[PDB]
DNA sequence: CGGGTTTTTGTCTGGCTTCACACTTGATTTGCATCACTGTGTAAGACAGGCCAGATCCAG
């Protein structure tokens, strides 16, 4: 298959992409359940009055990460 | 320099296939250009200069 079948073919394994809800509401975590990688620095400031900040990260939410690694597994369980 | 004897073929002959060929338009799928960067360049040798040490020389 061309690059884009392959390219199209990759958004169903990647986290973000199958529907979830805990029973219990997280709390200080959102509902969503579409995101794929999260900034790593999670809003922080990196204005000049600020820390200084000299890092850069790249990261995905915890929860649709453990969904889609559960996903992953079906036909195992 | 050209006579015999099979190969190598396009047809004649007209009549049966299986594919070929006008139009759309809205998608859907491929194909290709573009952009900010990457690695491989990766240990020793030649030469001048300050510094004491000790040899080189001076004079009572």
Partial sequence: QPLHALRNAEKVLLPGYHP????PPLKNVSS???VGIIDGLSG???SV???????????FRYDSA?????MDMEEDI
């Fill in 20 to 23: 979830f809800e805990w029973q």
């Fill in 32 to 34: 969503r359940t579409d």
């Fill in 44 to 46: 922080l400031a990196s």
């Fill in 49 to 59: 009055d600020e820390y200084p900040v000299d890092t850069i990260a790249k990261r």
């Fill in 66 to 70: 453990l969904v889609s690694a559960l």
